[PDB]
């Protein structure tokens, strides 16, 4: 449950986010779309990020919560 | 099943106990548990963050808890 | 729940778009996506290698693509 | 769980001191207070909830009779 | 589903093509595939070793193959 | 299906094995027992190794295969 409304709010409002991968790498951009397994992260070009490789999704400003 | 995980996280959420969450990569997160589901935890401070359970090694409350 | 993953990989495949695949350990693989299923991706170049999805962190096209 | 459960339960019942090695090399020490399918509650200086997916090996300080 | 993984590993096993298997920790194994199931691959050489799929990042054949 | 008879052979024949973990650590010993999720690796003190943390199991000698 929770993931969906939270990611959807980030998508809809085009909130800049930081995504930390399980290996410590930080990606930055905005959530273009997502499904059950992946997130499409936009910047220069989009990239498909697998959820299994993500540790934390951190928005740049406070957002409405589920 | 989740017979220990849920009441433990729920108690920490209800009582607003500050926690430390250690990730598998050694990074330490701090805050209060806002809510959780079977896959993620929403950790609160000025901005919340969504933490995937699969990346968590351990949850350490700042003070004692009891089921 | 592959409503995004499938069409996206399928588009990279059909258009033979050069991609970079980054593994969890930091290795960058380069090539084009020849095929894929629920668990693996067959990546072409000198030889075709089979990459397990569970090892992949990000897939990055060398040029923007349209869904 | 034909091996995992009675092994963890015996450690718990007999209060055996254990070392838990995490996949990232970190060693936790303590007493097994409780566990379910996914986590172990590790007691001492303060309790902590350890996710099994992060554990590589459980090493008791003395052998246990199953 | 397994509609790419199984035929690919089976082709490798049947043709006895030597492969390199890279693990997520960066170690490289080499051998021929003797058999496999949903979870493990039996990798042959001096002795046969059992490799869990979850620890594998890529399988690289020594020469290219027909699917 | 392949895992079980293979593990069973190593056990009942008491073949010494090296077990490599996903972090590169090597464990040595004999397989006392196992279930769907863990392997009990016997020696000095037994230790319960989680399957999710194992990369490869290597017998010290060739064994009959399934």
From Swiss-Prot, chain D:
GO molecular function: RNA binding
GO biological process: quorum sensing; regulation of carbon utilization; regulation of DNA-templated transcription; regulation of RNA stability; regulation of translation; regulation of translation, ncRNA-mediated
Domain named Sm: residues: 5-64
Any Gene Ontology CC annotation: cytosol
Keywords: RNA-binding, Stress response
Task of the protein: RNA chaperone that binds small regulatory RNA (sRNAs) and mRNAs to facilitate mRNA translational regulation in response to envelope stress, environmental stress and changes in metabolite concentrations. Also binds with high specificity to tRNAs.
Assembly behavior: Homohexamer.
Entry similarity comment: Belongs to the Hfq family.
Identification of the protein by name: RNA-binding protein Hfq
Phylogenetic placement of the source organism: Bacteria, Pseudomonadati, Pseudomonadota, Gammaproteobacteria, Pseudomonadales
Covered residues, full protein: 5 to 70 of 82
